[PDB]
C-alpha cells in the first residue's frame, strides 16, 4: 500500500545563532519583498533613466 | 382571597432518568440528607436530581486550581457529575477526588500521580456527614447555548451572537451592523 513514512529527526543540540536566526519579522519582510518586488524594479529603471 | 398561580413549587423532587445506579444513589443520599441533618447531604441530594445541563462537566485544571487554594490540603473534592481530563496541564498533584463517571483519560492521569479516587457510595461509607470536603461544580453558564441569550441582538448593546446559518461575509453584516449601510446597532 501507500502507507505514509516520515523522516525521524529525533533530537539535536541547538546551535548558537538559532536564538536570532528566524522570527516573525523574517516572514513579514519576505511578504513585503514579494509584494514590492516589481515596483522597486520599475523605480530603479526610472532612476537609471535619469542617471 | 389569594391567587394560586405561584402556589406550586416548580422544582423537581425525583430524577427523570431511569438509571438504576442513579436511582440507588438517590435512595441512599435521600436517607442520609433526611437523617444526618447535613446541609452538604441536602445539597448533594439536590444536585443528583439535576439534568444533563444543570450538571456541567468540570475540567481537571479547574479542579487543580480550586484545590490549590489555601485550606484544601487534605480535603476531598466532590463533583456531582462528570470530571474530564485536561490536556493543557502537564503535572498534577495527589488530587484525592470523588466524582461521578470519571473519564478514562483522567483515570490514568490521576492514578499515576498517586492519589486514590472513590465513588459516591464509598464517600457515604467514609464520611456520612460530609466532613473535610469541598463541593465543586463546573461552569454552568459556560455552555454555548447561553451565548445566544440576552435581551435582543438589535439593541445597541447586544453582544448576543444572533443565529446565523453560515458564518462569514455577506451574512448578517450590512444593515444594522455598520454605519455605512443604514445604522450602527
Amino acid at each position: 500500500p501507500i502507507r505514509n513514512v516520515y523522516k525521524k529527526e529525533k533530537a539535536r543540540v541547538i546551535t548558537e545563532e538559532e536564538k536570532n536566526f528566524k522570527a516573525f519579522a523574517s516572514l513579514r519582510m519576505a511578504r513585503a519583498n514579494a509584494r514590492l518586488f516589481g515596483i522597486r524594479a520599475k523605480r530603479a529603471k526610472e532612476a537609471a533613466e535619469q542617471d | 382571597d389569594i391567587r394560586h398561580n405561584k402556589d406550586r413549587k416548580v422544582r423537581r423532587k425525583e430524577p427523570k432518568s431511569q438509571d438504576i445506579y442513579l436511582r440507588l444513589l438517590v435512595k441512599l443520599y435521600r436517607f442520609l440528607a433526611r437523617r444526618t441533618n447535613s446541609t452538604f447531604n441536602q445539597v448533594v441530594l439536590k444536585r443528583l436530581f439535576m439534568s444533563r445541563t444543570n450538571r456541567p462537566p468540570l475540567s481537571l485544571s479547574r479542579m487543580i486550581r480550586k484545590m490549590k487554594l489555601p485550606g484544601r490540603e487534605n480535603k476531598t473534592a466532590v463533583v456531582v457529575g462528570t470530571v474530564t481530563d485536561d490536556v493543557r496541564i502537564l503535572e498534577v498533584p495527589k488530587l484525592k477526588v470523588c466524582a461521578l463517571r470519571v473519564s478514562s483519560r483522567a483515570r490514568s492521569r490521576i492514578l499515576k500521580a498517586g492519589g486514590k479516587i472513590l465513588t459516591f457510595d464509598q464517600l457515604a461509607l467514609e464520611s456520612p456527614k460530609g466532613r473535610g470536603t469541598v463541593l465543586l461544580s463546573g461552569p454552568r453558564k459556560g455552555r454555548e447555548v447561553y451565548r445566544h441569550f440576552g435581551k435582543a441582538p438589535g439593541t445597541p448593546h447586544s453582544h448576543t451572537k444572533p443565529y446565523v446559518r453560515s458564518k462569514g461575509r455577506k451574512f448578517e453584516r450590512a444593515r444594522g451592523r455598520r454605519a455605512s449601510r443604514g445604522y450602527k446597532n
Binding site: - | D19, L24, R35, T36, S104, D121, A124
Partner: protein, 52 residues
C-alpha cells in the same frame, strides 16, 4: 474480545469495559454499617395525629 478493567480488548481496537458507577450496589449493608449509623438522628417514630 471485551477485555477487563486493567487491559483493553485485543480484538476490538479502541474499546474498553464500561465504567462501574456504584462500587457496592447493596443498600442494606451500607445503611446498617456502623460508620453510617454512628452519626445518625433519633428515629422519632411518633405519629402525632390530629387532636380534637
Amino acid at each position: 474480545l471485551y477485555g477487563t478493567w486493567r487491559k483493553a480488548a485485543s480484538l476490538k481496537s479502541n474499546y474498553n469495559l464500561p465504567m462501574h458507577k456504584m462500587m457496592n450496589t447493596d443498600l442494606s449493608r451500607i445503611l446498617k454499617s456502623p460508620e453510617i449509623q454512628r452519626a445518625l438522628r433519633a428515629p422519632r417514630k411518633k405519629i402525632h395525629r390530629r387532636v380534637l
